[PDB]
Symmetry: D3
Subunit: 132 residues, 6 copies
């Protein structure tokens, strides 16, 4: 039933004034905020931990540089089937109706991260909320 | 082209203050209200009749309990291809862009019913609007 | 504390697809629907009763004709200080922020009626909801 | 891949006061206006050229009639993958989440046109914005 | 009393993706577009004429600079009491419920201009729409 | 011009799912989040300190009870004239167009606190963000 998932609101959301728009979409599907931190600039080690599965890719450093270019919010959301449901809400830039489908048009500047699995959720929550 | 369909706004929509949000999505798709009733509490007999096709399912009684747990609005909507279009608007909890997709996250508490066929529409309209 | 007020959603709201927009504004201020009726065309006697205080004015018949030109919803709303608060939400065509201020621009086609006093509320509710 | 595409806001959008709603959906996806013309009533020749590929279909003249029945806005939008993305945003009357999916319910009165290919985009831009 | 008024959507509205939001507030009040021009960068002369009455103020040239720092839309709107009503809709940065009250927070970068009188409306329309 | 102010999102905003709606209104007015904390339950001592100027009022204890009845968000916002502008956005339950005017209808459960002066802002920021 109940799950917790990790969401990042990305620097481009701040730049484009879409923070509340994104949070509102998750809130409207009835998911609750369990933990939340605002980072004026997230420490790079946290970002590199978060994206460690990508450490070998050509885009790794550039993506980290983006994620450090402005503020981030890290949020733990709770609700039924939260991991998959918030992943679906995130969507992609090809799918209207979703956060990325309605609001994003870039492979990197895509507004929001949501955990993609039970395993990744557990790990991302411990990165951003280790006092847990 | 022109059809009529039956919509129920469920008790969870009242509890969560989403009645206008739901009705607004249908209105914006250019469907028109032909008939509408507000029930502070719907008669259990009407609920059991509405969900008669589910009477042998494990969830039948609990669902009926939920459907009488608060107010409901029954609406007849009219427009081109209304039955399937409003069904598509209803959607499901997995599909963002739809009413249930954007707003609901429960197998039972899912905000809206819309008729799924011509036969069920005629039957459901008859139930809520016997006049 | 708690009051009930009578709201009419006018034919122009139907014509312009603003029914839910208007109802949403009242719902968002936390007022609850206690009674509601949809009228494909309201009987004229009800409209003339509703506007009886205006029976002598030059605009009486024309206003009644408008109120009968399309569907109406009659709603009883309940909440703290409902009469005055919903009156304020209705507002007027000069006051942005209000239903009429944001959405209406006519002396007659102004989308919504809300009871203006305790006395008028009691009387309007009994017109539209006599089985009460 | 930066692209430019042609959008028409149709007379039904003006009639239904949905012009800003439509433009806003495109604006929110980060597409930029490159040029724009308002036509209180579009010259018929421009409409016939626009739908030239449809001249042998039974609906051609009634569709043209509709397209001159009220104002039109023609817009050149620019952005990454604009042709395909704005086409997707336009969507269809069956798919909620899109402009047509949320707002339209007719085969003819469907609110918006967006170029469907690189070739048609070049051609449609030359019709509405020959300069 | 049917009137026509001149509206400018300013470069900050384009920068902040608020063009449709602004136009939508006017559209929802039932005002109609009579003409519209998009300016990727407005000719400076047009801007200097528009703010001619301010030519002796200290902010004149910096204000002009801002007004050519990005695109502009000039619109002629029509409706009952349009000059006063659209002026009121524009509002000020202190008053929530209005365009500037909800969306702007600067003396210069304030999103929208609306004609403030019958005389200025006639004059502003002649600048932007001389034809 | 530039100021910082302290905002609390109150427990009733969480209960009614209005957190983003409230934050969205401030964001749209171009104010920026400088600091933010989520409290699943705020320490009563912090609440009593925040409302210290009310300690001799009849409603003090009940208000504190309410303020610890659910989660709160404390936010420092920054922008031009932030203290009074965000105060104006907060508004009151009588004034439509504002946060409390559109969304609240209670003397206690009123969704948002915003600092009302420079002195109270410095003091309130110090309370919630002692760092
Ligand atoms: N191919 C490619 N991929 C990129 C580039 N920059 C960033 N990315 C990837 C890194 C991330 O996995 C993804 C966006 O961030 P995210 O939080 O992982 O979302 P998602 O990809 O799981 O849906 O985009 C890039 O420049 N090229
Ligand atoms: N599958 C399922 N449905 C439940 C449960 N509890 C209540 N329901 C209700 C909610 C659905 O709106 C209603 C009918 O759903 P179907 O999925 O039965 O819909 P339909 O056959 O009317 O088109 O059953 C439940 O526990 N499981
Ligand atoms: N002066 C004038 N007043 C008119 C005209 N047509 C309608 N009215 C009045 C009748 C109503 O009192 C008012 C609008 O309806 P309502 O439900 O009474 O709202 P309100 O006037 O109490 O705010 O407009 C009209 O043509 N001229
Ligand atoms: N298929 C079809 N199209 C019609 C009819 N009447 C008007 N039209 C217009 C609406 C369409 O936008 C226009 C072009 O046809 P299309 O390429 O199938 O649609 P589309 O690419 O705009 O989605 O034809 C009609 O009766 N049938
Ligand atoms: N008063 C003032 N106005 C400035 C300044 N810099 C740019 N402006 C511009 C913004 C105003 O829209 C424009 C015209 O002045 P106005 O008539 O007082 O404002 P308004 O009628 O557009 O609300 O002057 C400035 O520094 N002070
Ligand atoms: N006046 C009043 N205020 C109450 C009551 N119960 C709780 N409160 C709280 C809600 C207000 O946000 C808080 C402070 O309001 P003021 O009106 O005291 O605001 P301020 O002095 O912080 O600017 O007092 C109550 O019963 N009456
Ligand atoms: Mg990923
Ligand atoms: Mg179902
Ligand atoms: Mg009256
Ligand atoms: Mg086509
Ligand atoms: Mg001026
Ligand atoms: Mg207060």
């Amino acid at each position: 039933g109940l799950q917790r998932t990790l969401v990042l609101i990305k620097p481009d959301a701040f730049e484009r004034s879409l923070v509340a728009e994104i949070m509102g979409r998750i809130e409207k599907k009835n998911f609750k905020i369990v933990s939340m931190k605002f980072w004026s600039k997230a420490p790079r080690n946290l970002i590199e931990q978060h994206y460690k599965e990508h450490s070998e890719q050509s885009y790794f450093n550039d993506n980290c540089d983006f994620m450090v270019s402005g503020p981030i919010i890290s949020i733990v959301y709770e609700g039924t089937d939260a991991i998959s449901k918030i992943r679906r809400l995130q969507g992609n830039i090809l799918t209207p109706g979703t956060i990325r489908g309605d609001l994003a048009n870039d492979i990197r500047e895509n507004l929001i991260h949501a955990s993609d699995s039970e395993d990744s959720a557990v790990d991302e929550i411990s990165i951003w909320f280790p006092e847990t």
